[PDB]
Amino acid sequence: VYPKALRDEYIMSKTLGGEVKLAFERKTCKKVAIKIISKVETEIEILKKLNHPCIIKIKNFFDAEDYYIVLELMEGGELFDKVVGNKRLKEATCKLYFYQMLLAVQYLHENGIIHRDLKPENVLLSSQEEDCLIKITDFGHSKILGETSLMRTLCGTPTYLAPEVLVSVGTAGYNRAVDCWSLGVILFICLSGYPPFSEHRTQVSLKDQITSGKYNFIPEVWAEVSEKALDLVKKLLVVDPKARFTTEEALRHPWLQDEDMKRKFQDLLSEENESTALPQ
Amino acid sequence: VYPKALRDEYIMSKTLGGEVKLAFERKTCKKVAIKIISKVETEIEILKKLNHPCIIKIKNFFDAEDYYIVLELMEGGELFDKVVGNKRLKEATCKLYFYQMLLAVQYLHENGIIHRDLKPENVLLSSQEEDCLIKITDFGHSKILGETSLMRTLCGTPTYLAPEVLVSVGTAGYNRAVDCWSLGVILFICLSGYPPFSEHRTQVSLKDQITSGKYNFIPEVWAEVSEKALDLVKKLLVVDPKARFTTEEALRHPWLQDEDMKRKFQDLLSEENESTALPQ
Ligand SMILES: C/C(=N\NC(=N)N)c1ccc2[nH]c(C(=O)Nc3ccc4cc[nH]c4c3)cc2c1
Ligand SMILES: C/C(=N\NC(=N)N)c1ccc2[nH]c(C(=O)Nc3ccc4cc[nH]c4c3)cc2c1
């Protein structure tokens, strides 16, 4: 059965997609989504402190036989369902969604959080309309940046310190780049309807495809996509994490300098919000 | 002032060497050492669970204005004081002490603990006699091995996973090798009376000396040391952490196949212990 404290506040309903259930908050008679994780504490603390229009908000939490995370309901479901079975979005729709993913992840990295599991299943859409807000979810693998062991190590004289630790200094502090790579793979899929690295009709192992950076490029699928969109993908799918585009660099890329797209996003934000009166 | 709960149980005395104070446990009238760390929880939990004759034991803990760690008193003081100012130990004494450091660190790695700050200041001697027991201390930088993020990452399909993470797999799980490198540096110092890497009369930076593995070799100091002892040092001061000797490999090295040394250690252990009667 559902835990009593959850029942006290919510009426549970149908499965939306771990499971995600529709529920109704009794107080408001409004819909919520309830993520059930079978037996997270850090994920909750992260979700509670973040405040961005493209990051899912937590409404409630119950730690019982299973975990119950109560969230705002995103009516449009998961991005995965828009791109599965070779389905692909209009380039303009890709740009609107990708811009928002970039804003969200930029906000995470500014706030010292790396997501580490960005994928279409973790991108939620606000409605069944093509032009909609998106929100990232699932901080179950996310890492909080703070002062490292390495930093403390480097404060003393390395008389006794192993060479591999001094070697690691060249690359330390780029862990956030893994999110930019996943973004690149998401963008590749949204624009083309097929993954850049996979075992479908190829002899090269998945690992080798990825570490070499040699994505599967099929000209015929890509001919209808703009040069600028592909140029961004290429800058994100860079094997060297120090050379890989950051979210700031991606947000400055020509493909994203799109006044009409940005207007649409601003309009959608305005429509979402229920603000109080304000002075002047 | 000292915290009341500490005063209740102990009478505090002179400074031995953060500070380390001599104190007397009131209950037994016996000497203890009290490490004061100015404002650790993990260090205490580690110290409480470890049980090896060459690892310092915790007797008590007080979390007050400062931390107070009550330990067994090692009358011989720190190894640092035996090797400072170019002083150097007889090779036989080096071997007896190094054997015990190896046993201690082998026990740590078997138990999923990496020390990460091995140095002469953290090696304590049981008496002012040359032939004595040694115990490692200071787990303030120590790391507890468990299931990694990497392990969980590798359980799924790396469709979205960044190449640097797959690259890291080749070297993961050798973090314990940093202790073997520090051991090598300790052994180098004990045998020679001088550090292998330093800025004394040289143009090469300390970092470069270390990452290249090019220790300062002075033939005249080393002529009186055995070939076998230096051979062990060389196998520990190996730049590649996957090729570097482990504690098991070091314990199997010819230099440590010394029946007389091992007999001395066994005799010293026997002398330390106050056991109860036993059956048969
Ligand atoms: C917070 C979280 N996971 N956390 C962990 N796994 N630790 C998570 C992951 C995936 C999620 N998906 C959703 C979500 O609302 N999904 C969803 C699925 C189908 C439909 C259909 C209409 N709206 C839907 C929403 C919430 C959600 C939360
Ligand atoms: C547990 C610990 N440090 N932990 C942390 N810094 N977090 C630590 C470090 C160094 C230490 N040194 C000693 C110790 O007993 N030192 C010492 C110093 C001088 C003399 C002279 C006679 N006996 C001595 C013992 C205890 C001890 C504990």
From Swiss-Prot, chains A, B:
Q: In which tissues is it expressed?
A: High expression is found in testis, spleen, colon and peripheral blood leukocytes. Low expression is found in other tissues.
Query: Which positions does the record annotate as the modified residue Phosphoserine?
Result: S149, S226
GO cellular component entries:
cytoplasm; Golgi apparatus; nucleoplasm; nucleus; PML body
Task: Tell me what the record says results from Y160C.
Answer: In BC; does not phosphorylate p53/TP53
- Enzyme Commission (EC) number: 2.7.11.1
Subcellular location(s): the record lists: Nucleus, PML body; Nucleus, Nucleoplasm
UniProt keyword Transferase present: yes
Protein's GO biological process: cell division; cellular response to bisphenol A; cellular response to gamma radiation; cellular response to stress; cellular response to xenobiotic stimulus; DNA damage checkpoint signaling; DNA damage response; DNA damage response, signal transduction by p53 class mediator
Which keywords, in A-to-Z order, does the entry hold?
Apoptosis, ATP-binding, Cell cycle, Cell division, Disease variant, DNA damage, DNA repair, Host-virus interaction, Kinase, Li-Fraumeni syndrome, Magnesium, Metal-binding, Mitosis, Nucleotide-binding, Nucleus, Phosphoprotein, Serine/threonine-protein kinase, Transcription, Transcription regulation, Transferase, Tumor suppressor, Ubl conjugation
Q: Which cofactor does it need?
A: Mg(2+)
Regulation of catalytic or functional activity: Activation is modulated by several mediators including MDC1 and TP53BP1. Induces homodimerization with exchange of the T-loop/activation segment between protomers and transphosphorylation of the protomers. The autophosphorylated kinase dimer is fully active.
Protein kinase domain residues are 10-256
Q: What is the effect of changing Y97C?
A: In prostate cancer; uncertain significance; somatic mutation
Reported effect of changing H141Y?
Answer: Confers a moderate risk of breast cancer; partially reduces kinase activity
Chain positions covered by the region annotation T-loop/activation segment: 138-164
Residues at the catalytic site: D117 (proton acceptor)
What effect on the protein does mutating D138N have, as reported in its record? Loss of autophosphorylation activity
Question: Which disease does the UniProt record connect it to?
Answer: Tumor predisposition syndrome 4: A disorder characterized by an increased risk for developing various types of benign and/or malignant neoplasms that arise at an accelerated rate and in different organs.
Tell me, in a sentence or two, what this protein's role is: Serine/threonine-protein kinase which is required for checkpoint-mediated cell cycle arrest, activation of DNA repair and apoptosis in response to the presence of DNA double-strand breaks. May also negatively regulate cell cycle progression during unperturbed cell cycles. Following activation, phosphorylates numerous effectors preferentially at the consensus sequence [L-X-R-X-X-S/T]. Regulates cell cycle checkpoint arrest through phosphorylation of CDC25A, CDC25B and CDC25C, inhibiting their activity.
Return the similarity comment. Belongs to the protein kinase superfamily. CAMK Ser/Thr protein kinase family. CHK2 subfamily.
Query: Would you tell me the protein name for this molecule?
Result: Serine/threonine-protein kinase Chk2
Organism this protein belongs to = Homo sapiens
